[PDB]
Amino acid sequence: GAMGMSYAYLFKYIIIGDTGVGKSCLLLQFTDKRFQPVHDLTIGVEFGARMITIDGKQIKLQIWDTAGLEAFRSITRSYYRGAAGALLVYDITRRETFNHLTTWLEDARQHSNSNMVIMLIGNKSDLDSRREVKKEEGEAFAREHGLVFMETSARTAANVEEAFINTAKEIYEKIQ
Ligand SMILES: Nc1nc2c(ncn2[C@@H]2O[C@H](COP(=O)(O)OP(=O)(O)NP(=O)(O)O)[C@@H](O)[C@H]2O)c(=O)[nH]1
Ligand SMILES: [Mg+2]
């Protein structure tokens, strides 16, 4: 397809974060409204895509789902380039995935535009009894670094639509 032919804008997203935080399940819940209970480790980039409506216009999201597993991750961070948005994801039940955010963020901004809209996502909000990271901590990291923030559950679909749609609304407001 092409912008000005089969859609008004194409917004490229990348989804980054530690292994098991729920990147792939967020994507699948977004496009297919299905929850995948098994952890299938992503290795190369996997592409997802969906049409959305923003301000009455047809926008296509091209979504690059990436490997969290360090053993599978390339040292060449070339797949950042061209992304209008990034979904930066951690597991609210696993403190270490939150501690790695600084490095993911640095990685993201060193190989992408300062332009890029970054949505910080605390996923697995359905597992409240196992919470290790306060909602306030994710809120504060976002503010401190000029990100938007949302907690989601790929399992129950809570805020999943909003995570992807609000990212696009942010991009839209930025560029027009
Ligand atoms: N309870 C619950 N489990 C979730 C949620 N999101 C993902 N999971 C589970 O967590 C595991 C990891 O999901 P996955 O999306 O594969 O994570 P990933 O970030 O893509 N991992 P990788 O980087 O290795 O590809 C799966 O077993 C999945 O079912 C959620 O919101 N709630
Ligand atoms: Mg994955």
Swiss-Prot record:
It comes from the Eukaryota. Its EC number is 3.6.5.2. Coiled coil: none annotated. The keyword Magnesium applies. One of its GO terms (cellular component) is postsynapse of neuromuscular junction. It is a lipid-anchor. GO terms for biological process: autophagosome-lysosome fusion; endoplasmic reticulum to Golgi vesicle-mediated transport; eye pigment granule organization; protein secretion; Rab protein signal transduction; regulation of glutamate receptor clustering; regulation of postsynapse organization; secretory granule-lysosome fusion. Keywords: Autophagy, Cell projection, Cytoplasmic vesicle, ER-Golgi transport, Golgi apparatus, GTP-binding, Hydrolase, Lipoprotein, Lysosome, Magnesium, Membrane, Metal-binding, Nucleotide-binding, Prenylation, Protein transport, Synapse, Transport. Mg(2+) binds at residues 24, 42. Disruption phenotype: Lethal from late second/early third instar larval stage. In the cortex of larval ventral nerve cords, disruption of axonal trafficking in motor neurons of presynaptic cargo, but not mitochondrial cargo. Aggregation of presynaptic active zone proteins (e.g. brp/Bruchpilot and Rbp/RIM-binding protein), synaptic vesicle proteins (e.g. unc-13, Syt1/Synaptotagmin 1 and Dap160/intersectin) and lysosomal cargos (e.g. Lamp1) in the soma of motor neurons. Synaptic vesicle proteins and presynaptic active zone proteins accumulate in closely apposed but separate compartments. Belongs to the small GTPase superfamily. Rab family. This is Ras-related protein Rab-2. It comes from Drosophila melanogaster. The gene is Rab2. The chain holds residues 1 to 172 of 213 of the full protein.
